[PDB]
């Protein structure tokens, strides 16, 4: 347990790990001030605290410059020089001292992908999203260059970056959050846009990095791929999630990203229930091939919350203005469950010691939502701070013209997917809701395309 | 100020470092450490948190989260794209580095 | 004279909306009219008694204020 | 077209921000005169007296409707019903 | 009342400001619990149950 | 101009300093983290952020142990072993490498006094208050020892310390704050005590160290001493303030602390007006004897606020909910003065750049108060946080019994003044309010003494 | 847990270091430095604040605070013990150290 190692102790009678002397690997976060007898320990955020599509353009000058294709004056982004997806762009490769992508399968010899985020190679889905965004940026830059032949590479790159960031913000705040918080919490915590506060702090809260891990309860135990007719693509249509962690060779040498996107569109998510929190695939076989032994994602979340020194469940309930339980009965009433409340009370000993993540995922879901009142409050507060404190918000005056805003308000994720890939059948509007084929799938020729005529100069 | 910066600097005119990259988080609540400043709960065996012993995170995951995988149910009003966009937005927002 | 019907349905709807009521059933207008009639009868009876004691034929605002005050409904702005 | 419950919320927001009277003055004055006709005949009313009566009646009705809304919400409902008004009046001690 | 008027971006004092001042202070609300202020309106309050 | 030095520049046509190459000495505060690029600069609070009579018992274990009378078992505080004030205790002397008290008077050779704070010898009034508190602690310890003969030294010391802290808290929150904030701000920001709220942060805000400097506007340009008949005591009935800085020899060798306390109790303070902010003694002759040139207290306050990186006047006005001026007319309306607003606009250029101290002291005073609305907001918030977030508050249950609380509620400053000092005539209640003789002075034989009969074991 | 601690620690059970001595201040508003983290306004010539030049502190103290001492107005409702107790309570609350 010598620093900076904080391994997870193994309790007795553990179903998986029989040896008590073993421990789960764990590394403490980097302190803000390395070595101090005065300052309270604080963590470091290495990425911009804005919704600015930093996943594709990076967050530092050297990496961002390396990500650009500085060989012509088209203002494009670097693509893979060795592999193609049916004649379409692919993410550039990365050079690392230790590469888990090569460790996953030594026969293929496919290194990890290079993008604005170092974790963009965890699964084929993230690589598919990053490649889709890169293709969209390249198409926007090419269209702008054709429309405005007098511009240079830097201007085209900046304009395409601005458009991509605006699209990300629009899609997020118009489709994702209303389905997360629910209409009541959406109206309570994220009202209509008024103007630009410069007095709102846009920094990311420490608790948020845990409160946003609720998606770990939406993880399905399989990765699904579908062919053109939205049928199970063979061989291996449903592949285990333990065999896709850091496996980039499933993108280059397994038919590209189109089947992955098709399976992404036409597969229901996992519902969060008080007796079904997280699947065993991520709870017992996380990074099994990459590491010596598998990890435990909920346990890792709890240990990270403890490492950051986040307060308990009751402190965050009081911070959000909600009643704070103290006994078994009050906790059961709050959770609308007595068996789960009894188990939590036995394990922790008092509600004040319940971890933020576990308490948040134990709370019942809101009406037409996916989070409890505490998690919904935290997420809504953080995203409202991000939106109101951002000077370059698309709806803010002086950033986009009225015609540009009107054109941008008509975008949609299915339009981007159908334009940037070979997919001809895409789901209806609110892609985060349609999951049944062919109940709510259209021919993609009816969806309007973004009009760039307002960008002429 | 025609376009965004790449490091987030000078987005807020009054405080240019606010919301930039490679900066410390903002604490909505005071930190709760075992010794007070720089030690987590469970680092030193035999210590108690508010009068109760600290439970093992692995034990908590073992006795609560675990459930048979054949009882899993799907969501009739969501899709996997929901989870994927959640992850993409999260990777957009924050990332906490750790030493090698 | 059926002037009790002068308190219309939109007026009661506005009064309920001011009170935070979102949905209104159609059977409560008669109840509201009856309640208003009872309250007005009590207050006006007290005011008329106050006026009669003073040997007057005009019901001043002060009489109404006193009648409201004696029922624990003090009103500010009329004396 | 607007889904039900939106215009109601807009009206709730609007009428909770203004201070104007919500009952027409002439019908209320006529009702007051009709009611006062029983106790005495050939009565004269100052305008201030009618205004005070209207203000008191409106305030009383608004408070009663707030209590009725609380009663209806208690019974897991959104729609105001006469039984809620009766319960509020009985608890407050008016009809008890 | 003057603070309420200033926050309302007005100069003079009207009965609405007096009602806002009285109803927003716990001790003053307790003191004037059975008092009706003419042309005072009501405090904005919408129950969360009726919210959409 | 090299770190940590932050010298003050001299404008052209300065009335005092004709030369421009000279500068006012100034040192930047010690940062919380000595050298970093990830963390914003923060300052250090070297004292306990509680109203716990930390002026006398120190805030560090070595100093607290060094301040006691360890030679006996009576649990007293160390007193001066060389001088006495007519048979009464005096503060112990201190050993410093560069003693400033010796420079004021080379002939006397009286070093600075030693107490729980390093700035206890700035002027004889602070020394008198410290000596009075030490005398009160010693008297309380002696009385407790007489009442309970079985107690040890440590128990007596702790009990006397608790009583002194409770007395200080009572005096402050019952007499001083209502006279500062005024009844409206006192009621708004300091409501009735309810219980101990462990979720209140009791730390001292950074702006408070600049918001609480308003007392620099109440300084009279003289020090007044009065004899037993409250007549001007000769020689030097009024001493210029520029000659009493760090002059401890005026305490030991000029009759003691009786005339200083008498002058404090029976002399009006200086009113704060928009055309008279601070006197010229603290503005042009601060520490004149000690250093080469005098300092500028308002300029020092403003430069310290600049060093701490505090926001401007408008940001703090927005923080407390008050409207924010933007133009000269709005500033004149807010300040209720046009000449001052015009001067401020000419000097700064915009209300956002006005420093916190100047903005706070320029505002018109509250009704029956002594600070503007912004300073009242900041001070009330800070003191409510201090009171509610303190576990050992004298009104908290378990700290004192009901009889002890009833006995402590009757304490007052005049009783302490005329109990441990040769003063026989003291002001009426609310010492801070009465300033005329003999209109509101009593014989000290009518004020009841503190009853310790409830401390019996 | 019968008496106070000299250092001030353990006053808050959840976070023992809250309100102790030799600890960093709490910021109610984000800091506003010249470069963003570790530079005061006016450190370097030619740099303006919020679009306006930074005024020399001595200059404004000369043109605003200064007033002839002869016209001092005594306070008929307060005494000097007001200021003295304010300073004493201040020396209780906070003290910002500087290097020697
Ligand atoms: C014990 O003390 C606790 C702290 O008390 C504070 O300090 C003392 C000195 C007093 O000044 C006191 O008034 C202070 O609150 C206290 O807990 C506090 O309780 C309040 C009320 O529940 C909490 O406020 C809620 O917080 C969030 C968001 O508010 C702000 O959070 C962000 C974070 O930075 C800020 O940037 C923004 O300004 C946000 O406004 C919300 O949940 C909530 O707003 C909603 O509240 C209800 C929801 O039902 C709605 O009616 C409203 O319209 C809003 O939609 C509140 O603002 C506060 O966070 C919390 N503080 C702490 C530190 O936990 C506690 O109650 C005390 N206990 C007792 C028994 O008195
Ligand atoms: C721009 O937004 C700021 C900040 O708004 C915050 O963030 C947004 C996203 C929303 O969540 C808001 O609800 C948040 O407040 C607004 O200025 C704020 O104005 C309010 C109301 O006047 C101020 O709150 C006051 O603060 C005082 C109490 O101090 C509080 O903090 C201390 C220390 O933490 C502590 O004692 C306790 O937490 C206190 O509550 C007091 O004067 C008063 O009671 C009131 O609560 C708030 O401080 C302001 N924030 C800032 C950062 O200055 C602006 O109004 C908005 N602008 C526009 C144009 O809309
Ligand atoms: C779908 C499969 C996913 C996998 C395999 C995965 C894996 C991981 C792992 C191993 C970590 C490190 C945790 C730690 O260091 O404590 C992490 C971090 C994180 N994850 Fe996930 N995750 C997935 C989905 C999601 C989703 C959908 C979300 C949100 C909607 C999410 C939210 C987060 C957050 C906020 C962090 C931040 C941790 C930090 O910054 O230190 N995860 N992810
Ligand atoms: C009466 C004579 C006083 C004198 C001669 C005096 C002198 C000083 C000086 C020279 C400083 C150093 C400031 C700096 O270096 O930036 C200081 C600090 C300070 N003073 Fe005064 N002061 C007096 C009274 C007061 C009073 C009555 C108050 C409040 C009611 C007060 C509030 C403060 C504060 C808050 C500080 C900052 C503390 C710190 O920086 O650690 N002063 N004083
Ligand atoms: C010039 C052109 O049409 N396409 C280029 C491509 O050849 C190159 O591989 C890529 C990355 O540098 O940049 C683009
Ligand atoms: C057991 C297994 O996974 N084998 C795969 C193989 O099917 C694939 O052809 C090869 C190259 O992609 O990588 C490896
Ligand atoms: C100018 C001055 O301060 N002179 C003093 C004098 O008043 C005092 O009597 C003497 C002994 O204490 O020390 C010297
Ligand atoms: C302090 O200690 C000395 C040791 O010689 C002793 O003489 C003196 O009386 C003590 N102080 C008090 C106030 O008793």
Element (H, E) at F247: none
Cβ neighbours of residue D40 closer than 8 Å, sequence gap 6 or more? C48, C52
Q: For chain E, say whether A183 makes contact (Cβ under 8 Å).
A: yes
Structure tokens, G8: 């001030």
Q: What is the 3-state secondary structure (H, E, C) of A324-378?
A: CCCCHHHHHHHHCCCHHHHHHHHHHCCHHHCCHHHHHHHCCCCCCCCCCHHHHHH
**Residue F174: DSSP 8-state:** I
Is-contact A307 B32, C-beta < 8 A? no
CA-to-CA distance for F445 and A113, rounded, in angstroms? 88
CA dist list (Å): B55 to A299, A336, F219: 11, 24, 58
Binding-site residues, ligand 4, Cβ < 6 A: F 122-123, 209, 212-213, 215-216, 219, 282, 297, 300, 304; G 83, 86-87, 90, 94-96
Using DSSP, state whether G23 is helix, strand or coil.
strand
Tokens 């990270």 belong to A304
Chain E: residue whose CA lies nearest to F187: E27
Is-contact D66 C19, C-beta < 8 A? yes
Distance of CA A11 to the CA centre of its chain: 32
Q: Collect all residues of chain G within an 8 Å Cβ-Cβ radius of residue B13.
A: 50
Is-contact A324 A318, C-beta < 8 A? yes
Chain E: residue whose CA lies nearest to C70: E34
Q: What is the 3-state secondary structure (H, E, C) of F71-128?
A: CCCCCCECCCCCCCCCCCCCCCECCCCCCCHHHHCCCCCCCCECCCCCCCCCCHHHHH
CA-to-CA distance for D65 and F125, rounded, in angstroms? 64
* Residue B90 marked in a binding site: yes
Q: For chain D, say whether C67 makes contact (Cβ under 8 Å).
A: no
In ligand 4, which atom is closest to the CA atom of F304? Answer: 16
CA-to-CA distance for A301 and A288, rounded, in angstroms? 18
Q: For chain E, say whether C20 makes contact (Cβ under 8 Å).
A: yes
Is-contact A116 A59, C-beta < 8 A? yes
- Closest ligand to residue A252's CA: 6
Instruction: Count CA within 13 A, CB hemisphere, residue F206.
Output: 26
Q: Bridge partners of A427?
A: A441
Q: Collect all residues of chain D within an 8 Å Cβ-Cβ radius of residue C64.
A: 49, 52-53, 56
Sign of CA dihedral F335, F340, F344, F346: positive
* Residue owning the nearest CA to atom 29 of ligand 1: A320
Q: How far, in Å, from the CA of A319 to the mean position of ligand 1?
A: 6
Roughly what angle, to the nearest 10 degrees, separates helices F124-147 and G80-93?
70
F156: buried, middle or exposed (CB in 10 Å: 19+, 13-18, 0-12)? buried
CA-to-CA distance for F112 and F132, rounded, in angstroms? 17
CA-to-CA distance for B9 and F420, rounded, in angstroms? 61
CA dist list (Å): F100 to C76, F221, F248, F249, F283: 67, 21, 10, 12, 20
* Residue owning the nearest CA to atom 10 of ligand 8: F69
* Residue owning the nearest CA to atom 26 of ligand 1: A320
Structure tokens, F448: 């009841």
CA-to-CA distance for A133 and A150, rounded, in angstroms? 25
A445: buried, middle or exposed (CB in 10 Å: 19+, 13-18, 0-12)? exposed
Do F270 and G75 make contact, defined as CB atoms within 8 angstroms? yes
Structure-determination technique = cryo-EM
CA-to-CA distance for F395 and F407, rounded, in angstroms? 12
Q: What is the 3-state secondary structure (H, E, C) of chain G?
A: CCCCCCCCCCCCCCCCCCCCCCEECECCCCCCCCCCCCCCCCCCCCCCECCECCCCHHHHHHHHHCCCHHHCCEEEEEEHHHHHHHHHHHHHHCCCCCCC
For residue F146, how many other CB atoms are within 10 A of its CB?
9
CA-to-CA distance for F232 and A419, rounded, in angstroms? 95
CA-to-CA distance for A253 and E43, rounded, in angstroms? 66
Cβ neighbours of residue F325 closer than 8 Å, sequence gap 6 or more? F314, F317, F331, F333, F334, F351
Structure tokens, A1: 């347990």
Q: Bridge partners of A85?
A: A88
Domains of chain C with CATH codes: 3-79 (1.10.20.10)
CA-to-CA distance for A285 and G69, rounded, in angstroms? 81
Largest Cα–Cα distance of chain G, in whole Å? 58
Is-contact A16 A24, C-beta < 8 A? no
Q: Which domain holds residue F38?
A: 1-457
CA-to-CA distance for E40 and E14, rounded, in angstroms? 9
Chain C: residue whose CA lies nearest to D64: C19
G46: buried, middle or exposed (CB in 10 Å: 19+, 13-18, 0-12)? exposed
Is-contact A293 A22, C-beta < 8 A? yes
CA-to-CA distance for A369 and A190, rounded, in angstroms? 15
CA-to-CA distance for G83 and B36, rounded, in angstroms? 37
Structure tokens, F182: 């005024």
* Rg of chain F in Å (alpha carbons): 23
Q: Where are the alpha helices (DSSP H) in A44-182?
A: 54-57, 61-67, 100-104, 124-147, 153-171, 177-181
CA-to-CA distance for A350 and A328, rounded, in angstroms? 9
Chain A: residue whose CA lies nearest to B71: A276
Binding-site residues, ligand 3, Cβ < 6 A: A 122, 209, 212-213, 215-216, 219, 282, 297, 300-301, 304; B 83, 86-87, 90, 94-96
Say if ligand 6 is within 6 A of residue A239 CB: no
Q: Which of A188, A261, A231, A235 is nearest to A438 (CA)?
A: A231
Tokens 């203005």 belong to A321
For residue A443, how many other CB atoms are within 10 A of its CB?
10
Using DSSP, state whether F375 is helix, strand or coil.
helix
CA-to-CA distance for A371 and A189, rounded, in angstroms? 14
Cβ neighbours of residue F241 closer than 8 Å, sequence gap 6 or more? F123, F219, F220, F221, F222, F223, F279, F281, F282, F285
Tokens 């134990």 belong to A362
Tell me how long chain G is: 100
Is-contact F335 F362, C-beta < 8 A? yes
Chain G: residue whose CA lies nearest to A201: G30
| DSSP E strand boundaries for chain G | 23-24, 74-79
For residue E44, how many other CB atoms are within 10 A of its CB?
11
Q: Collect all residues of chain B within an 8 Å Cβ-Cβ radius of residue G38.
A: none
CA-to-CA distance for B9 and A454, rounded, in angstroms? 29
CA dist list (Å): D26 to C6, C42, D51: 9, 21, 11
Is-contact A63 B6, C-beta < 8 A? no
Q: How far is E25 from chain C (nearest CA, A)?
A: 18
Q: For chain G, say whether B16 makes contact (Cβ under 8 Å).
A: yes
Q: Which of B5, F321, G36 is nearest to A390 (CA)?
A: B5
* Residue owning the nearest CA to atom 18 of ligand 3: A213
CA-to-CA distance for A425 and A232, rounded, in angstroms? 15
**CA angle F385-F387-F393, nearest 5°?**
150
Say if ligand 2 is within 6 A of residue F321 CB: yes
Closest partner CB to B74 (pick from A180, A268, A302): A268
Give resolution, Å, one decimal: 3.2
Is-contact A27 A6, C-beta < 8 A? yes
**DSSP labels, A21-77:** S--B--BPPPPSSSS-SSSPP--EE-S-SS-S-HHHH-SSHHHHHHHB-TTSSS--B
- Which chains would you list as touching E if contact means 3+ CB atom pairs under 8 Å? A, C, D, F
CA dihedral F404, F406, F408, F409 (to 10 degrees): 160
Structure tokens, F335: 């300040």
- Which chains would you list as touching C if contact means 3+ CB atom pairs under 8 Å? D, E
Cβ neighbours of residue D55 closer than 8 Å, sequence gap 6 or more? C75, C77, D21, E36, E38, E39
Class of D1-96 in CATH: mainly alpha
Is-contact F280 G66, C-beta < 8 A? yes
C66: preceding bond cis by omega (within 30 degrees): no
Is-contact C21 D69, C-beta < 8 A? yes
Question: A85 — phi, psi (to 5°)?
Answer: -110, 90
Q: Bridge partners of C76?
A: E37
Instruction: Count CA within 13 A, CB hemisphere, residue F133.
Output: 28
Say if ligand 1 is within 6 A of residue F299 CB: no
Q: Which CATH number covers residue F305? A: 1.10.640.10
Structure tokens, G4: 């106070």
Q: How far, in Å, from the CA of A320 to the mean position of ligand 1?
A: 6
Element (H, E) at D7: helix D6-15
Q: Bridge partners of F426?
A: F442
Structure tokens, E46: 């919408």
Question: A238 — phi, psi (to 5°)?
Answer: -105, 110
Q: Which of F59, F86, F88, F64 is nearest to F77 (CA)?
A: F64
Say if ligand 7 is within 6 A of residue F102 CB: no
End-to-end CA distance of chain A: 62
Element (H, E) at F268: strand F268-270
Q: How far is E28 from chain D (nearest CA, A)?
A: 19
Q: Which of A187, A136, A185 is nearest to A371 (CA)?
A: A185
Q: Which of A411, A130, A441 is nearest to A266 (CA)?
A: A441
Do F117 and G97 make contact, defined as CB atoms within 8 angstroms? no
C12-50 burial code (b ≥16 CB/10 A, e <16): bbbbbbbbbbbebeeebbebbbebbeebbeebbbbbbeb
Distance of CA F233 to the CA centre of its chain: 26
Do B17 and F39 make contact, defined as CB atoms within 8 angstroms? no
Q: Bridge partners of D44?
A: C58
Sign of CA dihedral F410, F416, F420, F423: negative
Q: How far is G83 from chain B (nearest CA, A)?
A: 34
Q: For chain B, say whether F152 makes contact (Cβ under 8 Å).
A: no
Tokens 């059933």 belong to C25
Q: Where are the alpha helices (DSSP H) in chain G?
A: 57-60, 80-93
Q: Which of F306, F286, F305 is nearest to F296 (CA)?
A: F286
* Residue A307 marked in a binding site: no
Q: For chain C, say whether D53 makes contact (Cβ under 8 Å).
A: yes
| Beta-strand pair D79-80/C23-24 | parallel
Question: F427 — phi, psi (to 5°)?
Answer: -70, 165
Q: Which of B32, B91, B78 is nearest to A371 (CA)?
A: B78
CA-to-CA distance for A277 and A361, rounded, in angstroms? 7
Q: Report the number of distinct structural domains present in chain A.
A: 1
Q: For chain E, say whether A187 makes contact (Cβ under 8 Å).
A: yes
CA-to-CA distance for F17 and F293, rounded, in angstroms? 9
| Beta-strand pair A238-240/A222-224 | antiparallel
Is-contact A56 A89, C-beta < 8 A? no
Is-contact F112 F100, C-beta < 8 A? yes
Distance of CA C72 to the CA centre of its chain: 14
Is-contact A404 A396, C-beta < 8 A? no
Cβ neighbours of residue F443 closer than 8 Å, sequence gap 6 or more? F424, F425
Q: How far is G9 from chain F (nearest CA, A)?
A: 9
- Which chains would you list as touching B if contact means 3+ CB atom pairs under 8 Å? A, F, G
F282: left (phi over 0), alpha (psi -120 to 50) or beta: alpha
Instruction: Count CA within 13 A, CB hemisphere, residue F218.
Output: 27
For residue F226, how many other CB atoms are within 10 A of its CB?
21
| Touch C-F: 3+ C-beta pairs under 8 A | no
Cβ neighbours of residue F320 closer than 8 Å, sequence gap 6 or more? F373, F374, F377, F378
For residue F149, how many other CB atoms are within 10 A of its CB?
6
* Rg of chain A in Å (alpha carbons): 23
Cβ neighbours of residue C59 closer than 8 Å, sequence gap 6 or more? C47, C48, C51, D36, D43, D44, D45, D46, D49
Tokens 């929901």 belong to B82
CA-to-CA distance for A245 and A289, rounded, in angstroms? 8
CA-to-CA distance for C63 and C51, rounded, in angstroms? 7
Q: How far is D15 from chain E (nearest CA, A)?
A: 9
């Amino acid at each position: 347990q010598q620093p900076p190692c904080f391994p997870l102790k193994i309790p007795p009678n553990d179903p998986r790990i029989k040896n008590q002397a073993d421990c789960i690997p764990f590394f403490r976060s980097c302190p803000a001030c390395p070595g101090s007898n005065i300052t309270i320990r604080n963590q470091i955020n290495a990425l911009t605290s804005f919704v600015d599509a930093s996943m594709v353009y990076g967050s530092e000058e050297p990496l961002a410059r390396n990500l650009r294709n500085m060989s012509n004056q088209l203002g494009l982004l670097a693509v893979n020089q060795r592999f193609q997806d049916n004649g379409r762009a692919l993410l550039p490769f990365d050079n690392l001292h230790d590469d888990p992508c090569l460790l996953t399968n030594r026969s293929a010899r496919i290194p990890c992908f290079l993008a604005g985020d170092t974790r963009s190679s965890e699964m084929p889905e993230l690589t598919s999203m990053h490649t889709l965004l890169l293709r969209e940026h390249n198409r926007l830059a090419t269209e702008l260059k054709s429309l405005n032949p007098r511009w240079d590479g830097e201007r085209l790159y900046q304009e395409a970056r601005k458009i991509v960031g605006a699209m990300v913000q629009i899609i997020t705040y118009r489709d994702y959050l209303p389905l997360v918080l629910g209409p009541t919490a959406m109206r309570k915590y994220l009202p209509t846009y008024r103007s630009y506060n410069d007095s709102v702090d846009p920094r990311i809260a420490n608790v948020f990095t845990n409160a946003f891990r609720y998606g770990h309860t939406l993880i399905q135990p399989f990765m699904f791929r579908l062919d053109n007719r939205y049928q199970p693509m063979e061989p291996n249509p449903r592949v285990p999630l333990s065999r896709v962690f850091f496996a980039s060779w499933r993108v280059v040498l397994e038919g590209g990203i189109d089947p992955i996107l098709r399976g992404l569109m036409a597969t229901p998510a996992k519902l969060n229930r008080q007796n079904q929190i997280a699947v065993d695939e991520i709870r017992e076989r996380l990074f099994e091939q990459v590491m010596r032994i598998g990890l435990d994602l909920p346990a890792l979340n709890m240990q990270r919350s403890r490492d950051h020194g986040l307060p308990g469940y009751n402190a965050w309930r009081r911070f959000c203005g909600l009643p704070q339980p103290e006994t078994v009965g009050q906790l059961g009433t709050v959770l609308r469950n007595l068996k789960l409340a009894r188990k939590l009370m036995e394990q922790y000993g008092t509600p004040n010691n319940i971890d933020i993540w576990m308490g948040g995922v134990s709370e019942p879901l809101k009406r037409k939502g996916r989070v409890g009142p505490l998690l919904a409050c935290i997420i809504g507060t953080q995203f409202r701070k991000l939106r109101d404190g951002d000077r370059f918000w698309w709806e803010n005056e002086g950033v986009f013209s009225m015609q540009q805003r009107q054109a941008l308000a008509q975008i949609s994720l299915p339009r981007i997917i159908c334009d940037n890939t070979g997919i001809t059948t895409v789901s209806k509007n609110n892609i985060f809701m349609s999951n049944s084929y062919p109940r709510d799938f259209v021919n993609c020729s009816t969806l309007p395309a973004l009009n760039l005529a307002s960008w002429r100069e | 100020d025609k376009y965004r910066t790449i490091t987030g600097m000078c987005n807020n005119r009054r405080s240019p470092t606010l919301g930039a990259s490679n900066r410390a988080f903002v604490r909505w609540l005071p930190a709760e450490y075992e010794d007070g400043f720089s030690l987590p709960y469970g680092w030193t065996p035999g210590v108690k948190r508010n009068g109760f012993p600290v439970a093992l995170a692995r034990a908590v995951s073992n006795e609560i989260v675990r459930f048979p995988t054949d009882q899993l149910t799907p969501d009739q009003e969501r899709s996997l794209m929901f989870m994927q966009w959640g992850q993409l937005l999260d990777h957009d927002l924050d990332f906490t580095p750790e030493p090698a | 004279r059926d002037n009790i019907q002068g308190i219309t349905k939109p007026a009661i709807r506005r009064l309920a909306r001011r009170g935070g009521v979102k949905r209104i059933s159609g059977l409560i207008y008669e109840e509201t009219r009856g309640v208003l009639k009872v309250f007005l009868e009590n207050v006006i009876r007290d005011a008329v008694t106050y006026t009669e004691h003073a040997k007057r034929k005009t019901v001043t605002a002060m009489d109404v204020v006193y009648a409201l005050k004696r029922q624990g409904r003090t009103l500010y702005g009329f004396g | 077209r607007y889904r039900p419950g939106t215009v109601a919320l807009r009206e709730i927001r609007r009428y909770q921000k203004s201070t104007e009277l919500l009952i027409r003055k002439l019908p209320f004055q006529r009702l007051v005169r009709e009611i006062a006709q029983d106790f005495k005949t050939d009565l004269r009313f100052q305008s201030s007296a009618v205004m005070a009566l209207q203000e008191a009646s409106e305030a009383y009705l608004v408070a009663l409707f707030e209590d009725t809304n609380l009663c209806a919400i208690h019974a897991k409902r959104v729609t105001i019903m006469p039984k809620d008004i009766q319960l509020a009046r009985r608890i407050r001690g008016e009809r008890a | 009342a003057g603070n309420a008027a200033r926050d309302n971006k007005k100069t003079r004092i009207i009965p609405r400001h007096l009602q806002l001042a009285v109803r927003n202070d716990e001790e003053l609300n307790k003191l004037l619990g059975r008092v009706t202020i003419a042309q005072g309106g009501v405090l904005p309050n919408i129950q969360s149950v009726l919210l959409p």
